Amino acid sequence: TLKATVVTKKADLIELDAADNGDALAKLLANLDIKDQNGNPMVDSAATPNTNEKLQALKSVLSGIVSSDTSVIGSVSNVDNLKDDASISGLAVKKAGTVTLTLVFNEDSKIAPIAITVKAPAATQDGVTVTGLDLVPGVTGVGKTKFTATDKIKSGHKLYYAVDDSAVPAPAVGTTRNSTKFANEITVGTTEVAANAGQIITVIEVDSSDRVVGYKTFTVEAADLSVAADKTGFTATVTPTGGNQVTTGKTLLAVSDLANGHKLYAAAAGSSAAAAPVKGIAYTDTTVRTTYGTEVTSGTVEVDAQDGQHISIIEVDENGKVVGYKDYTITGIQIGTKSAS
Ligand SMILES: [Ca+2]
Ligand SMILES: [Os+3]
Ligand SMILES: [Os+3]
Numbered sequence: 001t002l003k004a005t006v007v008t009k010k011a012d013l014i015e016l017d018a019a020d021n022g023d024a025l026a027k028l029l030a031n032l033d034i035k036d037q038n039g040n041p042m043v044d045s046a047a048t049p050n051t052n053e054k055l056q057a058l059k060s061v062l063s064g065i066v067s068s069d070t071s072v073i074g075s076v077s078n079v080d081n082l083k084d085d086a087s088i089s090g091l092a093v094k095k096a097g098t099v100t101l102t103l104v105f106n107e108d109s110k111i112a113p114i115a116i117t118v119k120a121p122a123a124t125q126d127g128v129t130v131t132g133l134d135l136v137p138g139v140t141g142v143g144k145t146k147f148t149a150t151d152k153i154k155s156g157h158k159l160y161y162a163v164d165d166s167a168v169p170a171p172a173v174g175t176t177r178n179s180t181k182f183a184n185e186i187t188v189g190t191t192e193v194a195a196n197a198g199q200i201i202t203v204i205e206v207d208s209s210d211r212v213v214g215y216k217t218f219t220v221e222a223a224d225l226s227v228a229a230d231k232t233g234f235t236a237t238v239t240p241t242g243g244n245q246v247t248t249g250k251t252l253l254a255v256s257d258l259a260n261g262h263k264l265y266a267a268a269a270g271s272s273a274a275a276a277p278v279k280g281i282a283y284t285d286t287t288v289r290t291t292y293g294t295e296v297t298s299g300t301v302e303v304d305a306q307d308g309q310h311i312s313i314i315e316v317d318e319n320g321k322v323v324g325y326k327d328y329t330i331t332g333i334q335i336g337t338k339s340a341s
Contacts (some may be wrong), residue, residue, distance in 0.1 A: 122170035128214035236326025246336025255299030261318030
């Protein structure tokens, strides 16, 4: 009954945010003024909740919307794709960037084309709610890095990472998470990444509705990556001991001065050394506790030994964490000879 007669833009530019939910139509509408035959404003009245007057008014006079870059915001050729079912859509944001959306009207309306520049910003560091997000060496394996933070995330928000040789481009704020690109959810102080030094860990923060709000990149340095347990963390001196004092085919692992609350655990004698656990792993870890199943802390423990075989020993601290590692090749001299059992 009322026909849209006058359409004018307010500003030449509109910039999107997270609240815009990665779709420009709501902000494009807010940037347009529509007047009818009477010169009266054409406004979405809340008394008619499931029919938007303003959008419908625009759609009745609009022949299309051209984008300057179809990869940033897709061009609208069929006008009925603009809708207000549940929410206002869709000048859908595909990628972060800046476009000139040019609105073309029908011949009847006689309204000349209106160009509105739309900026869809990339997600940034100040959009990240977790303060002090940083990389530390891993404790689950060797060559691993771990996420740490000082303060918690905002309630409802989540973190996701990507690991690559190059930084993954910052997505537009408000766009729904790229499942493919950012597939690895971060539990802070728990989750670990296998990475090489020099690689980039690209982290995005999403909201409750899986939409990109934050973005931070870390360059993985050798300092941020985990290494095997060293002789550096090994304080005790262990002397394999044989002769007539020790049982035949067994070596006495005589222990000298470990630090007050330290413990020592030996792996069973085998043809080559046992795998050195990552510095910081709990002894209670299944592979660690099964490989290094014999506690040799007392200095009085004697274990099975053959000539060529290796005995690897780990030094665990007061807390229950692996600190030191050293591998011992056994000799016939340090294998026992005393009467059996
Ligand atoms: Ca309405
Ligand atoms: Os939120
Ligand atoms: Os200690």
